[PDB]
């Protein structure tokens, strides 16, 4: 046994969305071993926040058209699926948006909760054409993981069935893209030992370092079953 653990070396946050993470030193062959295993968890298991429920007043269903609005309700929902939100304390928050006048409604027009950060304030939601038009809606944001469709959510609970709440897709999972490259390390005089440079591209928030910690955590939790139980 010539055990040798890697250490998190560099976190180059090129952007809040894009980050490179170099990792060394890794013993020969562990580069691809950890590289891929991590990539798989990072794409699927990672938790995040997403719009689960929408309630616009004067809207009975998603297929109708609202007056003074360029976008159909479906178009608006699709924009809320892509809305970047960080919730710090609670796992479930209802944000309120009341806006009027001749304006492209952005994410900043939502009344921000004390512990709720809108990561992309310029994110487009709706275009108000008539000046007399006013839009009022309640966006429910929940924290979860992976992709929970409205079709898998319209066949489980449904104790209260309020006519007006619209259920749409919310890909909780923050990781948009991930790739792991392996290059030469040139450490002391080992040579073979390389480095793990993982290029992540996520939506708003989920912090690169934090995400790697969680991914490795999930891996080690599963390994408990192969170590502890034989």
């Amino acid at each position: 046994t010539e055990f040798l653990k890697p250490r998190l070396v560099d976190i180059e946050q090129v952007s809040s969305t894009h980050a490179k993470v170099t990792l060394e030193p890794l013993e020969r062959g562990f580069g691809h071993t950890l590289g891929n295993a991590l990539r798989r968890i990072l794409l699927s298991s990672m938790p995040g926040c997403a719009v689960t429920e929408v309630e616009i007043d004067g809207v009975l269903h998603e297929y109708s058209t609202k007056e003074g609005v360029q976008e159909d309700i479906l178009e608006i929902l699709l924009n809320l699926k892509g809305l970047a939100v960080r919730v710090q304390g609670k796992d479930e928050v209802i944000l309120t948006l009341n806006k009027s006048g001749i304006g492209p409604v952005t994410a900043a027009d939502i009344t921000h909760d004390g512990d709720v950060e809108i990561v992309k304030p310029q994110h487009v939601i709706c275009h108000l054409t008539d000046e007399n038009a006013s839009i009022s809606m309640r966006i429910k944001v929940q924290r979860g993981r992976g992709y929970v469709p409205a079709s898998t959510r319209i066949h489980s609970e449904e104790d209260e069935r309020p006519i007006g709440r619209l259920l749409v897709d919310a890909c909780y999972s923050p990781v948009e893209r991930i790739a792991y490259n392996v290059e030469a390390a040139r450490v002391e005089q080992r040579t073979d030992l390389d480095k793990l440079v993982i290029e992540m591209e996520t939506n708003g928030t989920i912090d690169p370092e934090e995400a790697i910690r969680r991914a490795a955590t999930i891996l080690a939790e599963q390994l408990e079953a192969f170590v502890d139980l034989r």
Binding site: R39, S44, H61, S151, I178, E199
Partner: protein, 50 residues
Amino acid sequence: GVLKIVKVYLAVKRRIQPGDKMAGRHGNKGVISKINPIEDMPYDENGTPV
């Protein structure tokens, strides 16, 4: 004979699934067999999956 008639219009959102028929424009047919998780999809050096 008919005193009154009521017409309901239902809307349905249908997503793609195995058994749906897809094709290109060169007469290449196909039936979806499987929807694969993004992790399993072949991906390029840049990281972008097919």
